[PDB]
């Protein structure tokens, strides 16, 4: 488990779950829970366990979004009857799967890219890639794509990222958009 | 008013020679004919030796149907088995009524080890419909049957609503499915999940992923 | 060629009545005294009924005594096998067979017999396609998923049985008394793109055949 390590950053929000109760955006960094201090996500996997253990039924929750710490109230889950807050880590926005012929294989996406901007908006999840393509409206969308692993010490370095024009192409059957991208599994 | 006897587990080597017993429980062996069936996976049994030893052609001349009247024994020998011989064999007799065998699964060693061929299915969209998502991790080409399925989710073991199969052979092979019920709020809570399975130390597996493309 | 085809199985309730039908061709019919043999998993083959080839004696196994009745009709050159009070321990597959003097020489492909308490549940029909990238890979496997039905069986083809060559129907797995498997086949991806494939999916229990064509998954 890779997701471990790095900081409670929202990426996917649940739907008719206990963050989506008391709207949590998509882009949360959270520091603190009740108490708990969260620094990576396996912080928050051992508060939600000693949050259950103790049978805490209220808490309190502190995050950072636009620079700012916000003070929520939510209710805790149960780690014994089969209860989760409902968010999932940053599905890292990397290409997957290249469909052969699709408009991304006509220019020349591989996978193991990661894509930065699309249109000159930073992405950092997957499914804001989606988002940003899904109302696309066919229309030429470029992307800013890293390509391959750096060496140490070198990874913060400002690169020439190579920069694609993509044009969406429509769907024979159903009748949508499809750049033919697959998420990384 | 009999019962006849019959080993269950039985392991010969490829284009070896097996004969297979079939002893009489009370009474004299000769003194009623025994009739030998063959029976593979499923399917319907076939007659392998009747009236004792003799053979309906058609069926291999390898087989061959024997009385050994001092062990009060029934023996179905097998010269040169081959893999299309490898099913279940039924013994069979009578006197006032009609009893069969206990069975005889006649396993053939010999087929070099192959390392299990994952196919990992997502939930179809109509079922999404229903908030229910079952996972698909289809298990096939692999030497011998003994397996060990687990599921993971995001890397975390889980082992709720998890159905695994008993592994079956089919055409020199063996084949398991498994399976994990989740509901459509599940399915979209991880990542990505995977299907480990561990086949004679080899351990390979394939992971599903709910986000799909653009 | 011998054809011996069973009929009248399927779900009935303990204690309540079932007959099996099972009519035979491709013989002199009247010169042949028949049977009938059943199957447990566990126990095994089990002998429970006889038939001269007149008709005029009835022979039982002692595995159940004075419950089932057998009788033909050389008219119509058929077995009839009536089963009064039923228990789930008669539960098994009912094979009918032709005797040759000492023997029996051909066998019915079977019908499974399931005394159960429980109703019939018709099974859920939906199509399984990889979610991965599409790749230029000269081959893909598609599959049917078949979930929740009782009892047993079902059986699924393939374009009507067309595509045979490739395909793998896994076994049942039991699960709050509800079964559930899968049936896979594996074609090309020159035969997907182009033309169509279906499975038919049948139960007899529930006396449902749904076709369910696989579709490529869009987003």
């Known amino acids: 488990p890779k997701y471990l390590k790095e900081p409670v950053v929202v990426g996917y929000v649940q739907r008719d779950s206990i963050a989506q109760k008391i709207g949590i955006k998509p882009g949360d960094k959270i520091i603190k829970i009740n108490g708990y201090e969260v620094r990576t996500w396996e912080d928050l996997r051992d508060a939600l366990i000693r949050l259950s253990l103790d049978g805490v039924k209220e808490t309190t929750l502190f995050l950072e979004r636009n620079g700012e710490v916000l003070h929520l109230t939510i209710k805790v889950p149960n780690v014994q009857k089969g209860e989760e807050l409902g968010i999932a880590p940053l599905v890292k926005p990397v290409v997957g799967g290249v469909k052969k012929g699709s408009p991304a294989d006509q220019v020349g996406i591989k996978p193991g890219d990661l894509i930065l901007e699309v249109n000159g908006k930073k992405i950092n999840t997957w499914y804001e890639l989606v988002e940003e393509v899904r109302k696309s409206q066919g229309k030429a969308i470029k992307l800013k794509i890293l390509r391959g692993v750096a060496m140490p010490g070198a990874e913060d370095d400002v690169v020439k990222m190579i920069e694609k024009e993509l044009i969406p192409a429509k769907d024979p059957k159903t009748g949508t958009y499809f750049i033919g991208l697959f998420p990384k599994t | 008013q009999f019962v006849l006897t019959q080993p269950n587990s039985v392991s010969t080597n490829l284009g070896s020679t097996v004969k297979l017993s079939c002893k009489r429980s009370?009474?004299?062996?000769?003194?009623?004919?025994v009739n030998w069936y063959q029976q593979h996976e499923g399917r319907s049994p076939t007659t392998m030796i009747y009236?004792?030893?003799?053979?309906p052609d058609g069926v291999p001349d390898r087989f061959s149907g024997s009385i050994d009247r001092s062990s009060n024994s029934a023996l179905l020998t097998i010269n040169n088995v081959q893999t299309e011989d490898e099913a279940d064999y039924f013994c069979?007799?009578?006197?006032?009524?009609?009893?069969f065998g206990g069975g005889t699964k006649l396993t053939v060693l010999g087929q070099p080890k192959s390392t299990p061929t994952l196919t990992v299915f997502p939930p179809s969209t109509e079922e999404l419909q229903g908030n229910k998502a079952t996972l698909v991790c289809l298990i096939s080409d692999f030497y011998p049957s003994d397996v060990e399925v687990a599921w993971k989710a995001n890397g975390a073991p889980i082992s709720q609503g998890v159905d695994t199969a008993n592994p079956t052979k089919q055409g020199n092979k063996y084949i398991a499915s498994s399976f994990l019920r989740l509901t459509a709020e599940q399915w979209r809570s991880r990542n990505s999940f995977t299907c480990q399975v561990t086949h004679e130390g080899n351990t390979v597996e394939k992971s599903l992923s709910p986000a799909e493309c653009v | 060629e011998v054809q011996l085809v069973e009929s009248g199985g399927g779900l009935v309730q303990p204690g309540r009545s079932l007959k099996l039908s099972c009519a035979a061709s491709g013989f002199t019919f009247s010169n042949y005294g028949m049977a009938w043999v059943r199957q447990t998993p566990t126990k095994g083959l089990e002998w429970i009924a006889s038939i001269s080839a007149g008709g005029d004696k009835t022979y039982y196994g002692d595995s159940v005594k004075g419950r089932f009745s057998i009788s033909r009709d050389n008219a119509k050159t058929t077995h009839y096998l009536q089963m009064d009070s039923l228990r789930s321990e008669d539960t098994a597959t009912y094979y009918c067979?032709?005797?040759?003097?000492?023997?029996?020489?051909?066998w019915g492909q079977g019908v499974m017999v399931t005394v159960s308490s429980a109703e019939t549940t018709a099974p859920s029909v939906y199509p399984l396609a990889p979610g991965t990238a599409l790749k230029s890979n000269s081959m893909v496997t598609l599959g049917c998923l078949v979930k929740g039905y009782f009892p047993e069986p079902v059986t699924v083809t393939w374009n009507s049985g067309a595509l045979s060559s490739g395909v793998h129907t896994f076994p049942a797995v039991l699960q709050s008394g509800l079964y559930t498997l899968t049936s896979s086949v594996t074609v090309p991806s020159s035969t997907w793109s182009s033309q169509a494939v279906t499975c038919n999916v049948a139960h007899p229990a529930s006396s449902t055949k749904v076709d369910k064509k696989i579709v490529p998954r869009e987003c």
């Open positions: 009370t009474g004299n062996i000769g003194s009623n004919y």
């Open positions: 009236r004792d030893d003799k053979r």
């Open positions: 069979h007799s009578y006197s006032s009524g009609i009893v």
């Open positions: 067979a032709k005797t040759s003097r000492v023997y029996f020489d051909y």
